[PDB]
Amino acid sequence: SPYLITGIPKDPKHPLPIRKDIDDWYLEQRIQLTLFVEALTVIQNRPLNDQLSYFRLAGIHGAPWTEWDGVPGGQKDSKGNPTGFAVHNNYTFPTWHRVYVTLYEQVIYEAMLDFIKQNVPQNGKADWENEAKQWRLPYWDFARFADELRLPILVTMPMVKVLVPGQPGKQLSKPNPLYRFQMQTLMGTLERPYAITSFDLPFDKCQSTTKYGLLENYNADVWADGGQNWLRANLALNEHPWYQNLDGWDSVPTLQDMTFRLLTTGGLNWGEFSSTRYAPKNWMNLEAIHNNVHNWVGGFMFSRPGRHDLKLWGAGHMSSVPVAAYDPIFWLHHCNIDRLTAIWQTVNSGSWFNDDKSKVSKDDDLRPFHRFCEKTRKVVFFRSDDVKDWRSLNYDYAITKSRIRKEISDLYGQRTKEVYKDFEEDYILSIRYSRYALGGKPFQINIFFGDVDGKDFYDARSQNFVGSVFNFSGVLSVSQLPARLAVHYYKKQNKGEVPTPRYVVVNSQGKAEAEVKVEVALHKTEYRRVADGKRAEVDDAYRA
């Protein structure tokens, strides 16, 4: 039978339960924690031929590009480009992923019920079923201060203590299914047709998902499980201009600034908000922010030229669209992207596929996700209008359940406001590029104000770095970066002059790509364009 995606079934006793912040949810805890851990462990341990195994569910998103729920799987097109179900660089990006997250949530809920049926004693039946019915997939608030932004506590824990129903007072420390996804062998040697086999990282050599764990110049057996370098990921997540590392300047995490802007800027239409797909004012979009977070969580650079004692590179699944869904944090990230969509919808209530560009895609089938159309009595694919109201999938968020503008400021606008207040003008960077510029491989666009260090053009530790744009998806693509504070620093160092944005396109070997076109400009409001960007050159040894 087709798998009909409904969201968790509606119980009068459980009216629109909320998806909680995963750090809040964990800190308060332990039946729901036990349920989620036990259910997800079962799901991750299902066989490859079980379509509701974790592997096959993550598989929907990308590699290994197989069928799912009876829907033919993908393949490389005539361009040489892998074709799968997930939508990137198009206006259905938020709605495709809305249904995807709901699928995952529903499968977990059903495994929770099966866990209760097999493991909980009569005394505890109804309480445990009650918690299953109130549970919803937690979100990771990547833009909320945990002083700094952080990966969820639970994601950084290799083991988690759970309850043992029937043995009161007894708890067990179990492998945490949110920490990593581990298979029984290297993903490159799975049974056909499931092997993860173009990609520029050795994901065929991984048994487990990893964050920053893949580096060139280590034994290939290290890549089987490169570990969870969550401290490194937290560092990347707190990216900000380089000058803010100097004494006497305050910092603001660029991710939080971007998210505050995304949620509070008015006058965007759906097409502008929903996607990177292409007034530079309106280029700050959901998908661009989501792309940078993918990069910062997983890492995308496998190597770096030269010799470096401190090694800040390292690659991992979340930066790679074909395999990102295997990392258990993928779903928590997309749960928050769904939350951000709901928030924006709530404060932009008429802007639903409302422009001439996105209207073309409004009625796209969101394959492979089935539902029953009661009006025609047929099994059909989800469409974006079916999930316009996320509440018809029987979940909500606290923030979307009157005080939403205040809550946005309180969660994402306090630091920005505090530091900006020290300086009444805004500056932004516009960035436009082609996701195909490097034959489909990912790349990072880094922008600098002032001289670029030809051996160090990578991150917030690089002299004069201002911000990055990550080409996750591998028509054009756009993004936007805050630039106000970095321009102020530059003006201070350079007699008030406005800086020329300088950019470098960095590939997964940490080298600069000279023929990837990027259009970068600096804009000002008391927006007008005030400087045109230029490519910076790097050292000979660092040139692709």
Contact positions vs Cu ion (CB under 5 A): 86
CB 441, min distance to ligand [O-][O-], A: 16
| 61 is annotated as contributing to ligand binding | yes
Is 370 marked within a binding site?
Answer: no
Task: Report d(CA 464, CA 468) in Å as an integer.
Answer: 12
CB–CB of 443/513 below 8 Å?
yes
Smallest separation (angstroms) from its own copies to the CB of 543? 17
Is the CB of 187 or the CB of 483 nearer to its own copies?
A: 187
Give the nearer residue to ligand [O-][O-] in terms of CB position, either 88 or 488: 88
In the complex with Cu ion, the residue whose CB is nearer, 86 or 132, is 86
For ligand [O-][O-], the binding residue among 196, 262, 289, 324 (CB under 6 A) is: 324
Minimal distance in Å, beta carbon 211 to its own copies? Answer: 11
Report the site for its own copies in 218-237 (rule: CB under 8 A).
218-219, 221-222, 224-225, 227-231, 235
Minimum distance, C-beta of residue 324 to ligand [O-][O-], in the bound complex (Å): 5
Q: Is the dihedral of CA 89, 56, 317, 442 positive or negative?
A: negative
Q: Which is nearer to ligand [O-][O-], 101 or 452 (CB)?
A: 101
| 421 neighbors 273 (Cβ within 8 angstroms) | no
Q: Which does 153 bind (CB under 5 to 8 A by kind): its own copies, Cu ion, ligand [O-][O-], none?
A: its own copies
Interacting span for its own copies (CB under 8 A) from 5-13, 307-315, 325-333, 493-501: 307-315
Counting contacts by CB under 8 A, is residue 215 touching its own copies? yes
Residues 61-90 that bind ligand [O-][O-] (CB under 6 A): 88
Is 44 a binding residue for its own copies by CB under 8 A? The answer is no
Whole-number minimum distance, CB 50 to its own copies, in Å? Answer: 20
Q: Are 84 and 103 in contact (CB under 8 A)?
A: no
Listed residue (503, 529, 531) closest to 517, CA to CA:
503
**3-state secondary structure (DSSP) of residue 71:** strand
* Angle, CA of 435, 441 and 444, to the nearest 5°: 70
Q: What is the CA radius of gyration of the chain?
A: 23
Picked from its own copies, ligand [O-][O-], Cu ion, none, the partner binding residue 356 (CB below 5 to 8 A depending on kind) is none
Where does residue 496 rank: exposed (0-12), middle (13-18), buried (19+ CB within 10 A)?
exposed
3-state secondary structure at position 529: strand
Chosen from its own copies, ligand [O-][O-], Cu ion, none, partner binding at 251 (C-beta under 5 to 8 Å by type): its own copies
Would you say 224 or 286 has its CB closer to its own copies? 224
**Judged by CB under 8 A, does residue 73 bind its own copies?**
no
**Which C-beta is closer to Cu ion: that of 86 or that of 107?**
86
Name the residue nearer to its own copies (CB basis): 157 or 404. 157
- The Cα 68–Cα 100 span in angstroms is 13
495: alpha, beta or left? (left if phi > 0; alpha if psi -120 to 50): left
- Residue with smaller CB distance to ligand [O-][O-], 89 or 446: 89
Q: Which is nearer to Cu ion, 382 or 489 (CB)?
A: 382
- List Cβ neighbours of 482 (8 Å cut-off, separation of 6 or more): 254, 257, 258, 261, 427, 428, 429, 467
Number of residues this chain uses to bind ligand [O-][O-] (CB under 6 A):
2
What b/e string do you get for 232-248 counting C-beta neighbours within 10 Å, with b at 16 or more? Answer: bbbbbbbbbbbbbeeee
Query: H-helix or E-strand containing 36?
Result: helix 31-45
Among the listed residues 251, 269, 394, 473, the single contact to its own copies using CB under 8 A: 251
Strands 443-449 and 426-433: unpaired
Is 317 annotated in some ligand binding site?
Answer: no
Residue 208 or 341 with smaller CB distance to its own copies: 208
- Strand-pair partners of 379: 372
Q: Are 472 and 508 in contact (CB under 8 A)?
A: no
Q: Is 43 helix (H, G, I), strand (E, B) or coil?
A: helix
User: 3-class SS at 492?
Assistant: helix
> How far is it, in rounded angstroms, from Cα 240 to Cα 253?
5
Binding-residue total with its own copies (CB under 8 A): 45
460 binds, among Cu ion, ligand [O-][O-], its own copies, none (CB under 5 to 8 A by kind): its own copies
If one asks whether residue 245 binds its own copies (CB under 8 A), the answer comes out as yes
Contacts of its own copies in 143-202 (CB under 8 A): 147-148, 153, 156-161, 172-173, 182, 184-185
Enumerate residues 84-123 that contact ligand [O-][O-] by CB under 6 A.
88
For position 101 contacting its own copies by CB under 8 A, the verdict is no
333 has binding-site annotation: no
Does the footprint of its own copies cover residue 460 (CB under 8 A)? yes
Residue in 285, 271, 215, 307 with CA at minimum distance from that of residue 430? 285
Please name the residues in contact with 499: beta carbons below 8 A apart, sequence gap of 6 or more. 449, 450, 486, 487, 490, 491, 522, 531
Closest to ligand [O-][O-] by CB, 324 vs 538, is 324
Q: Which of 47, 310, 526, 540 binds its own copies (CB under 8 A)?
A: 310
294 known ligand binder = yes
Residues 14-33 binding its own copies (CB under 8 A) are 26-27
Please identify which residue in 125, 311, 406, 529 interacts with its own copies, judged by CB under 8 A. 311
The closest residue (CB) to Cu ion is 86
Termini Cα distance of the chain = 51
Nearest to 298 by CA among 374, 186, 203: 203
Angle subtended at Cα 234 by Cα 231 and Cα 236, rounded to the nearest 5 degrees: 115
Annotated binding residues: 61, 88, 97, 290, 294, 334
Q: Which residues bind ligand [O-][O-] (CB under 6 A)?
A: 88, 324
Binding-site members for Cu(2+) are 61, 88, 97, 290, 294, 334
